[PDB]
Design a protein around this ligand. Structure first.
Ligand SMILES: OC[C@H]1O[C@H](O[C@H]2[C@H](O)[C@@H](O)[C@@H](O)O[C@@H]2CO)[C@H](O)[C@@H](O)[C@@H]1O
Ligand SMILES: OC[C@H]1O[C@H](O[C@H]2[C@H](O)[C@@H](O)[C@@H](O)O[C@@H]2CO)[C@H](O)[C@@H](O)[C@@H]1O
Ligand SMILES: *[C@@H]1O[C@H](CO)[C@@H](O)[C@H](O)[C@H]1NC(C)=O
Ligand SMILES: *[C@@H]1O[C@H](CO)[C@@H](O)[C@H](O)[C@H]1NC(C)=O
Ligand SMILES: *[C@@H]1O[C@H](CO)[C@@H](O)[C@H](O)[C@H]1NC(C)=O
Ligand SMILES: *[C@@H]1O[C@H](CO)[C@@H](O)[C@H](O)[C@H]1NC(C)=O
Lengths: 105, 668, 105, 668
C-alpha cells in the first residue's frame, strides 16, 4: 500500500460550492491513497521527518502515529468564481484544486 | 493625392460648399465629396466609432459635446490670429471642457417668415393667431404652418414663458434641474395643443409640408431659419422676415444654433481638413459661395458678417437670437431632444396630456450622465483587429439564369501605396464572373482566384499585382461611383457590391446570396452576410479614461457591437492578450451587443466577465451562460464599469456585427 | 481536534540512524497531530483539495477518506553525516528534519 | 630605513658576509644582521611558514627544493647578463621545476686534508688506512678522524662503490629507485664498520672532535671542505689537501653541494635582498671578503673563481667534485638524509647491522612524495588572522621579593610608520613596573596601563603616543639587543621578554609567571603562556594548489599548528567564513596539531572535518569527538586531501600554538 495518486471525481453541488462555483459541474481532484511504511520509495521522496516518525511509530505504535500519504504538489483549474457583489469572476488558474504528486509527510 | 468626405444637412448650402471643395481640389489636388445623409447627426457617432466616417461633419454645436464626449472629434488648434478672425462666443459654443472641438461657421435662429400679400400685418402675439386663422380660413387659406415633428420649431414658445432645458449657473449646467415641467412650458405647449385641437394646425405638419404651404401661398405664415429664404426667393411669394410673437406678453426665446464643423478623430487627413475649413471655408469668398447657395444667416466671420448684417432678414435673425438662449453643447442634449420630441408628438396627436407628456419629459430629459471623458488610446497601449461582414455601403442580390455575375468593390485608403489581399472563393457546381474594382490610392494587390472563369476591370496604373493575369482584363473608365455601377451592370447583373475603407484583407464568396433580393441597392451599414468578409487595415480608434472617485487599480476593457440590420443570432469570437500583466491582475471585460449576439471568449489570465445575451469559452465550451441586461449607451457602459469598482478603462471600442475580434493590451 | 503542531522527541539510535548520524543524540522533531474536519481554520490554511475531500468524505465516509494533518513546512538542523568512504561530513543545514508549520492536505 | 636578517651555517665566513652587510648598510642605510643558528636548515621551514623568518637563508641547494616546494622561497629573476656572470650548472642547481629559487654562491666538495709532517704520503686507497692507523698508533697518534654524526662525510665511500640516492634518468629523478641497499653501498659501509670495530676510529667522532684532532696534530688525516682550511691555517699544522682515496679501485664520489642564497617569500624586503645578494655579494670584492673570512672553495662567480682556481686546495676540491655527483635538490632529500643518518649511526654504534640499517634506509629514504606545488595565495583570495602566545624569541621568569619588575619587548615592522595597540593588564593584589620597548621603524602607539605604577623607556623620536604620559619616561640608549637586556636588568629583574615581528596588538599580563624559572633566557619559538598574547599584523603567507588527477570540484582548507615547546593540553578556536560560496559547496577542513591540541570549530556552511586529537563545535558543544592520526608533513596533509577526493587546496597555512584563529575565503 505505497503512497500513490488515485482518482477522485468531485461534484461542486454535493460539497455546496455550486453557488460560487458555476463552472464546471464536476472535475478530477486526484487523492493520495496508500500507506506510508518504511522503507519509503524513491519516487515518494519522503521527508526525513516522515521516515523518523514512521520508525518511532514502529517502535511505539500506540504512542506515535504513522507517516501520512498526502499531496506534495497541486495544480490549478479554470473556474468561474462569484463575488458577494455579484460579478462573474473567472479565474483562469484557481490554484490548489488538483493533485500533481503524492508523498509521505 | 487625398480626399475629404463631408456631411451636412440636406437643407443647407452644400452645393456652394462643394464648389469651395472644387477650389480646394484644384489648389491641393484633394478631392472633396460633400454629402447630406438623413439624420446624419445620429448616424455620425455610430460610424465614427468604427473608424469609418466623414473627414468633417457640419451640424449645430448642441451635438458636438456628445460626439467629442465619446472621443469622436479631434481637437482644433487654430492660431490666435485666426481665432481673432471669428467672434468669441462662437468659439465658446464649440469649446467643451476647455478644448476647441469644431470650427464655428454660422449662427442660426428661427424667424417668422410671413407672406406680405396674404398677411400685410403679422401678429405681434401668439394669442391672436387663432382669430387670424379663422379669417384666413374664411378666405380659403391658413394662418400658420411649421414643422411639428422636430421640437426645435416649438421650443421658442415653450421657453417663451420661462421654459428651459438645463438650469445654468456658476459657469456650469445643472442636469438634475430641468424646467420643462414648470408653469411656462405647460402654458405654451397647452396653447399649441389648443391650436391643433381647434384645427388651426394639423398635428402631422412637418418641414416639407410647411415649406410647400408657405412657398405656394397656401398659408400666410411659417417659422424657419435663414436657409429657407432661398426657397422662398425662388417662389412668387413676397415674404417678410420679422421677430417671433410674444406669448403671455413675453418674447419667444428660440434655441440659437451655431453651425459648426467638427473633424473626425479617425480621419488621417486632419491636416488637410484644417486646411480646407480655415483657409478656404472661413474666408470671405467661401462663406460668400455657401451663403449664395443657401443663406447662413449671421456668419461667424466678422468681415463677411459685417456685410451680411445689412440684410434685414439677417437682422431679424439676430433680434430673435438675442431674445433667445444659445443651446447647451453638453451630451445630455441628445436625450433631452429625444424626450422633448416624444412629448410634443404625443401631445399633438392626442396620445398624452400636456402635464403627463411634460412630466415624463422632465424625467427622461436628464439621464445617462457622463462618468469620464474618453480619449484616444495609442496603438502601443492597445491594439484591435477583427473580421466583419458589414461595409460602409453594401448590397447583395441574386441573379437567376444569369450567365455572368458581376461584383463591384469600392476601396479607399490613406494617401499612400497600400497592400491588399483579395481572395475569391469558388461556388459549388461554370458561371463566368466579372470583378470591377475601383481605388482612390495606389495599391499592391495579392489576387487569388482558383477555378474561376474571371474577368477584371481596374486601373492599370494604380493597381500592381503580385501575380498578374494577361488576358480578360479591362481598363476602368473615369466615372462617378454610380455611373461605375451602371456601366458594370451593362455587362451583367450585379450580385453584390460594397464600399470598403482601407481594407487589409477581403474574402468574397460566390453563390452565397442571402434571402431573395433581385436588385442590388446600396444601403449604408449593410450586412453582407456570407457574401463578403473583410479585415480592415485601421481599426476603430482605441479609447479609455480614468473613473474618478474609484479606489484601487482595476482595469476595464469594453467592447460594444453596433446594431446589425436584421440578421439571425450570431456568435462573436473574442481573443484577449494582456501583455506585461501582473501575476494577480484585477481586470474586467464588458461585451455589449444586440440581443441576437452570443459571445465566445478566449483569454489567458484571470479577469471579470460582463456580457449581454449569452457567453461561452474554450474551456468547458458547452453549457452556455445567460447574460444580463447592460446599458446601451457608451456612458451607460462606463457607468456600469464604475458599478464594477473599475477605476480605469484601459480599452474602449465599438464595432459592427463581426465574427472574430482580437485585442492586445499594454501600459504595464 | 484541529490540526496543530505537537512535540515529538526523537533518538537516532532507536531509528537506526546513530551509525551515519553521530550528532546529536536526540532532537525535537515536532509532529502534526489532530483531525482535519471542516470548517477548516484560517491558520491551517487548508488547500481546497483538502476541503473538498473532507466534504466528499462527510458524504461517503466509507468510500472516501478524510483530509490529513501533516507538516506544510520543514526546517533544517545541524548534524554530522558519515560518508561510505568514511569522512565526518558536517551539514550545517541538513534540511527537512523538524516541522515549522502544520496543515491539512 | 630597512633590515636584512640572514642565516648561514656557523662554520662559514659569516663575518665577511657581515662586512658586506656593513658596506650595504652605509650605501643603502639598510642594516644587515647575519646569524648562524643551530640546524638552521631544519628550523627555517618551520618559522618561514609562520611569516617569521630571515630575509635570506644560506645553505646547500639540496634543501631549497623542499623549501620552495612548500612555497617558502620567492622566485629569483636575474637579468640574463647577470645570469651570464655565473656558471650555468649552478643556476641548474638552484633551478627547480623551471624557476630560479636561489642565488648560487659557491661550490663545496669534501677533500682529504692530511698532515704533511705526520703523513708525508697520504694513502691512495681506503684499504690501507687500517695498517697506517696501526703504525701511527705505535707512534702515539691516529690515522683518520672525521665527523661520523652527519652522513655527508660518509657518502663519498658509500657512493664510491656504486651507491646512489635516487636513480636519475630522462632529465628526472626516480624516487622509487634507491641505490642504498645495493652491493657497493653495503661494501663501503661494511668497511667503515670494520674501521670502527677494529678501533681505527671512534663511532662518536663528530665535526668538532675531528677538527680539533687534526688541527692539534693528534690525527694525521681528516675529511673536510674549504671552510675548515682557515682553521688549519691558524694551526701549526703543515697540511696538504688532495683527492680522496679509492675504494675497491674506484674513486670516492662525494655529494657536491652548492652554497646558495634563497629569499624568504614572507620577506617584504625582497627588492633589497636582490640588491644585496646580486650587486654586493656576487661581486669580486664581496666574495673576496667572505672567502677571506672562510674559504668558499670554488665560487660560482666566473671572475673570482678564475682567481681562486690557482689555489691548489680549490683545485683538489674541483677534482673531488668532478669525480662525485651533484646533490639532487628534490624535497625527498630531507627524508633521505634523515634515513641515511639513522642508518650510519645505528651501524657505527653497533645497534643495527649493515644489511639491516641499509635495507631500512632503502625503505625510509624515499617517502612522502609531493602531491602538488604550493603557491602563495593573494589576500583577496584568502585571509587569516590569529592570536598566539608564541614569539620569535621569548623568555618568562619569576622575581621573588623584587620591588620592581622589568618587561622588555623587541618590535620590528616593515619600512613604514605602523600602528600598534599595547595593553598591560594589572595583577591581583603595589609593585611598580618598568617597560623597555625597542623598535626598528616609526610607530604610532595606543598604550593602555590602568592602575599600574609604570615607567617607560623608548625612542622619543620613533614612538608617538595617542595618550602620552609626561613623567617617569626614559630615553632608550643606542645599544645592541643583548646590551639592552643587560642595561634594563641594571634597574630590576626581567620577568619576561619577547621579540615580535610586525605586531598588530599586544596583551601583556603581569604576575602570570609560569612554572618556576628565576632567570629569563631568550629561547627561539618560546611559549609565553599566560604572560603575553599578541595579534601579528602580517599572517603566514596563504598557500594553495591544484591536485592533478582528481575529478570534481572540492575545496580543501588546511591548517597546521606547529610544535609547541612542552605545554599542557590546549583548545584552539577556529572561525571560518566562506564568502561567495555556492549554496551546496563541497569543501573540507584539515586541522593538524600536536597530540595535546583540541579543536573548537565555528563555521557557517556545510563542509567536511578532518582533525587530530579531538574537536568540538558551538552547536552541541559538549560530547567531544575523538580525532584520527593525520600525516605530519605538509605533503602528507596534501596527500590526505587527495585521499579526501579534494581537487583544489583553496587554503594552506601553518601557525604555532595559538588560542584563536579566523579564516576568510574568496575565489567565488
Ligand atoms: O429638432 C431636434 C434638433 O434640433 C436642432 O436641429 C436643428 C438645427 O439646429 C438647425 O440648424 C436645422 O438643421 O434644423 C434642425 C431641426 O430640424 C439640434 O441642432 C439637433 O441636435 C436636434 O436633433
Ligand atoms: O649531513 C647531512 C647534511 O648534508 C649536507 O650538509 C652539509 C653542507 O652541504 C655543507 O655545506 C656543510 O655545511 O656540511 C654539511 C654537513 O654537516 C646537506 O646540505 C644537508 O641538507 C644535510 O642535512
Ligand atoms: C482616399 O480617400 C481617403 C478617405 O477619405 C483619404 O483619407 C485618402 O487621403 C484618399 N487618398 C487619395 C490618394 O486620394
Ligand atoms: C486611374 O483611373 C482613372 C479613371 O480611369 C484615370 O483617369 C487615371 O489616370 C488612372 N490613374 C492613372 C495614374 O492614370
Ligand atoms: C625593520 O625590520 C624588518 C624585519 O627585517 C624589515 O623588514 C624592515 O624593513 C625594517 N625597517 C626599518 C625601518 O629598519
Ligand atoms: C632611536 O633611538 C636610537 C638609539 O637611542 C637613536 O640613535 C636614534 O637617533 C633614535 N631615533 C631618532 C629618529 O633619533
Amino acid at each position: 500500500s505505497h503512497c500513490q495518486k488515485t482518482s477522485l471525481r468531485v461534484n461542486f453541488e454535493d460539497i455546496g460550492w455550486d453557488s460560487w462555483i458555476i463552472a464546471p459541474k464536476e472535475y478530477e481532484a486526484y487523492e493520495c491513497k496508500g500507506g506510508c511504511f518504511f522503507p519509503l520509495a524513491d519516487d515518494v521522496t519522503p521527508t526525513k521527518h516522515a521516515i523518523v516518525q514512521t520508525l518511532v511509530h514502529l517502535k511505539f505504535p500506540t504512542k506515535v502515529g504513522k507517516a501520512c500519504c498526502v499531496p506534495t504538489k497541486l495544480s490549478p483549474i479554470s473556474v468561474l468564481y462569484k463575488d458577494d457583489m455579484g460579478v462573474p469572476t473567472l479565474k483562469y488558474h484557481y490554484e490548489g484544486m488538483s493533485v500533481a504528486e503524492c508523498g509521505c509527510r | 493625392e487625398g480626399k475629404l468626405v463631408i456631411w451636412i444637412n440636406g437643407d443647407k448650402g452644400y452645393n456652394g460648399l462643394a464648389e469651395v471643395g472644387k477650389k480646394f481640389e484644384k489648389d491641393t489636388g484633394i478631392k472633396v465629396t460633400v454629402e447630406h445623409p438623413d439624420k446624419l447627426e445620429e448616424k455620425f457617432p455610430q460610424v465614427a466609432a468604427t473608424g469609418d466616417g466623414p473627414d468633417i461633419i457640419f451640424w449645430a454645436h448642441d451635438r458636438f459635446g456628445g460626439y467629442a464626449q465619446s472621443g469622436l472629434l479631434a481637437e482644433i488648434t487654430p492660431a490666435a490670429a485666426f481665432q481673432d478672425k471669428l467672434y468669441p462666443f462662437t468659439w465658446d459654443a464649440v469649446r467643451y471642457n476647455g478644448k476647441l472641438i469644431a470650427y464655428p461657421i454660422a449662427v442660426e435662429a428661427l424667424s417668422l417668415i410671413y407672406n406680405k400679400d396674404l398677411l400685410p400685418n403679422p401678429p405681434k402675439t401668439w394669442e391672436e393667431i387663432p382669430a387670424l386663422d379663422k379669417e384666413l380660413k374664411a378666405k380659403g387659406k391658413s394662418a400658420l404652418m411649421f414643422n411639428l415633428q422636430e421640437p426645435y420649431f416649438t421650443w421658442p414658445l415653450i421657453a417663451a414663458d420661462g421654459g428651459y432645458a438645463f438650469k445654468y449657473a456658476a459657469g456650469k449646467y445643472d442636469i438634475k434641474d430641468v424646467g420643462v415641467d414648470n408653469a411656462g412650458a405647460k402654458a405654451g405647449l397647452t396653447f399649441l395643443v389648443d391650436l391643433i385641437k381647434n384645427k388651426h394646425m394639423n398635428a402631422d405638419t412637418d418641414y416639407s409640408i410647411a415649406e410647400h404651404a408657405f412657398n405656394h401661398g397656401e398659408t400666410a405664415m411659417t417659422i424657419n431659419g435663414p436657409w429657407a429664404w432661398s426657397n422662398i426667393d425662388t417662389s412668387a411669394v413676397n415674404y417678410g422676415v420679422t421677430v417671433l410673437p410674444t406669448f403671455k406678453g413675453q418674447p419667444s426665446k428660440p434655441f440659437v444654433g451655431v453651425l459648426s464643423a467638427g473633424i473626425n478623430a479617425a480621419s488621417p487627413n486632419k491636416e488637410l481638413a484644417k486646411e480646407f475649413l480655415e483657409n478656404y471655408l472661413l474666408t470671405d469668398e467661401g462663406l460668400e459661395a455657401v451663403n449664395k447657395d443657401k443663406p447662413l444667416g449671421a456668419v461667424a466671420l466678422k468681415s463677411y458678417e459685417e456685410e451680411l448684417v445689412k440684410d434685414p432678414r439677417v437682422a431679424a435673425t439676430m433680434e430673435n437670437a438675442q431674445k433667445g438662449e444659445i443651446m447647451p453643447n453638453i451630451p445630455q442634449m441628445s436625450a433631452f431632444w429625444y424626450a422633448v420630441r416624444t412629448a410634443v408628438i404625443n401631445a399633438a396627436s392626442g396620445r398624452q396630456t400636456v402635464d403627463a407628456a411634460l412630466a415624463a419629459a422632465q424625467t427622461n430629459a436628464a439621464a445617462e450622465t457622463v462618468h469620464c471623458d474618453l480619449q484616444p488610446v495609442g496603438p502601443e497601449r492597445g491594439e484591435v483587429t477583427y473580421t466583419t461582414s458589414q461595409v460602409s455601403k453594401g448590397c447583395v442580390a441574386q441573379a437567376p439564369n444569369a450567365i455572368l455575375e458581376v461584383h463591384v468593390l469600392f476601396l479607399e485608403f490613406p494617401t499612400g501605396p497600400s497592400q491588399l489581399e483579395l481572395t475569391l472563393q469558388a461556388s459549388k457546381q461554370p458561371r463566368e464572373v466579372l470583378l470591377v474594382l475601383s481605388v482612390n490610392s495606389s495599391v499592391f494587390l495579392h489576387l487569388q482566384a482558383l477555378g474561376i472563369p474571371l474577368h477584371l476591370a481596374y486601373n492599370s496604373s494604380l493597381v500592381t499585382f503580385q501575380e498578374p493575369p494577361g488576358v480578360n482584363t479591362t481598363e476602368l473608365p473615369s466615372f462617378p461611383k454610380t455611373q461605375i455601377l451602371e456601366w458594370a451592370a451593362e455587362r451583367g447583373p450585379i450580385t453584390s457590391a460594397a464600399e470598403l475603407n482601407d481594407p487589409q484583407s477581403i474574402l468574397l464568396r460566390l453563390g452565397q446570396a442571402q434571402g431573395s433580393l433581385s436588385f442590388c441597392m446600396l444601403e449604408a451599414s449593410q450586412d453582407m452576410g456570407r457574401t463578403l468578409e473583410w479585415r480592415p487595415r485601421t481599426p476603430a480608434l482605441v479609447r479609455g479614461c480614468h473613473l474618478e472617485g474609484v479606489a484601487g487599480h482595476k482595469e476595464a476593457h469594453i467592447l460594444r457591437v453596433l446594431p446589425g440590420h436584421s440578421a439571425g443570432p450570431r456568435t462573436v469570437t473574442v481573443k484577449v492578450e494582456l501583455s506585461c500583466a501582473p501575476g494577480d491582475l484585477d481586470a474586467v471585460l464588458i461585451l455589449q451587443g444586440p440581443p441576437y449576439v452570443s459571445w465566445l471568449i478566449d483569454a489567458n489570465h484571470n479577469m471579470q466577465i460582463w456580457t449581454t445575451g449569452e457567453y461561452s469559452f474554450k474551456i468547458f465550451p458547452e453549457k452556455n451562460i445567460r447574460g444580463f441586461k447592460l446599458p446601451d449607451t457608451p456612458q451607460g457602459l462606463l457607468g456600469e464599469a464604475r458599478m464594477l469598482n473599475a477605476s480605469i478603462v484601459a480599452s474602449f471600442v465599438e464595432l459592427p456585427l463581426a465574427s472574430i475580434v482580437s485585442l492586445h493590451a499594454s501600459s504595464c
